[PDB]
RNA sequence: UCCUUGUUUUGCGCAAGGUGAGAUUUUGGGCAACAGCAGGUCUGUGAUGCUCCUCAAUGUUCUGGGCGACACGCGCACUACAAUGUCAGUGAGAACAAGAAAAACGACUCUUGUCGGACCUACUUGAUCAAAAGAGUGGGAAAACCCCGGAAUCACGUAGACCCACUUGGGACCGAGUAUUGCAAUUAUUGGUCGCGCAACGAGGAAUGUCUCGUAGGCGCAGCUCAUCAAACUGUGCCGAUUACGUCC
RNA sequence: ACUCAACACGGGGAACUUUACCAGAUCCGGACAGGGUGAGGAUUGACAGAUUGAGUGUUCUUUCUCGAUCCCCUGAAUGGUGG
């Protein structure tokens, strides 16, 4: 229906926002959910799945419980799982979090960003970009670019390949902005718009 | 107020707590099934008072509040009741 | 009317197709499944 | 304005300094520095070691 | 692509015609590099530095009332209605359109785990006597909603009426009545009656705007906002040209 | 906001609400008791009377209903459509 799709949008929004704030620096990619008929799997994409669960088991049932108490869900209609994402490099948001941590620790912008770039471009990524605007001086609102490999912004097709993350760091004097992109070496449309090949 | 009594119970054997931020009353719970009737404002006040003592941990999304009860919070709560317990979060599972 | 994802009630409320996402603008607050292609 | 002189030096706070123990003198003084900066360190200044450093606070 | 076997020194290509639904960035949109601006936004935010308001708080209030809308007839920006004979002005009848909107309240009733009321439209009473407007039955979560789609531009000589006038062309002021909406109306209401029209204005100085095709122009409908009102904004459809297809002043 | 990248623009067709602003009253949100008042407290709730636009229970009197959270002093604080 009209309303179904909208309400699904709402549910995803609320869920995604709750996690992406309050559970962070675990290499959080995001979440994905699907129905199994009167139950919803709701897998949680993280690099480190141990913090998601908890070693006391409190975390996973807290996050189930918060959802239940809001939406009037009950057990056996709701569930939460963990999923191991290998290569934190290929997750925009995950790299974003680790970078944010470096900056809040009061480490150098250059050194920090170079860490992200090294990590990403090792796993075979086409390109990456780290655009950190904000304070680093005063008195500017200076913007620093770091650009690596190659990246496309052409078409609407680019949006599917390239996942993006924007986050904030909060420091003395005020806000510092952070952004990470990362063009994946593996398509999510299974499509390219360049290089006609010849099979010999 | 005698109102606050009901909410002092609401902490216990309900795990994580949830509220909506509103200036106008509405029942915070749903999951616990206790069905206390309390205005939201009062609930919020108590949540905040013992957040300031480090007992409770706050987390927030959009306009909603979700309050988790720490190890410390559990300990305190058990003493304030008198009633010893095997720790609120870990009992449920 | 009034809004449920702010309490501002000003800076304009969408109530089209039973949703509010214009007291927090939808360009910033996406993942409702909408896209622009045309 | 012929007179408004001394405006700033009226208003400012006076701690009126703070007590301190006597310092080494003669060779003893020169000793004191040569130990601090050039020994118990991996570096000699240079600007590589900074002789005075201060804590943070406020930034603009 | 072919062809003109033209133009093409060979190339990159160009023009006309042809096949053809369609002749070149196929057509219309959408996205878009680098360098930036002391552009706008701290009344979008749980996005924020500091330092102001922090209780005769100014913060804050389902609190009450008022403002943002005022009127020397003052300037500017944008909009809409006209001065009519190329809907032309009051009357009647015919044929005929397309996206899109809609529903669900812990409120009642229902049971061993729970159903119908805030959306529309149909039909009939609303004329043994108006409009506005009352109410009952009936269906829909939409390719179901009664033909899913209709009345404006248009057509019409039915031998309609007016007829070259500031009128019977236009409305804007102004008074009286009533019903509808709402937590509350103080022309809020306005799809309504019926006064004033013989109040303006006759295509309107200088100046200046933007479009080469199903476009311009003309016309209507829905969505949007939401106690209630659209000359606004957004989208769909209908009627549908003149000139140019060149140059760089 | 003010040549253009102002001026049917701030999805801004605002009457009470929205509200910055004005005319007045109110709340604790001032939480946090570490320095004080438990019973009978500065209190929660309250008919009448009064207060005042507001029989409104804020307030004050009467008398009743009282948890001792509300209340007292500092520090601390949070909230804001303020720049």
XYZ file of C-alpha atoms (C1' of nucleotides) in Angstrom, chain E residues 80-84 87-90 166-167 169-171 199-204 218-220:
23
model
C -4.967 38.942 -10.793
C -9.551 41.612 -13.322
C -10.948 44.696 -17.347
C -11.867 48.298 -20.873
C -15.609 43.456 -25.167
C -17.317 33.890 -25.528
C -18.841 39.279 -27.247
C -22.556 40.138 -22.739
C -26.545 38.207 -19.397
C -18.013 53.200 -19.759
C -23.563 49.673 -21.235
C -18.878 45.929 -20.931
C -16.324 45.496 -15.721
C -16.049 45.014 -10.821
C -16.825 53.810 -8.804
C -12.519 52.928 -11.787
C -10.544 51.622 -16.610
C -11.519 52.453 -23.466
C -5.525 48.406 -24.966
C -2.822 52.885 -22.006
C -5.392 30.886 -24.143
C -8.190 27.540 -20.546
C -9.595 24.330 -16.606
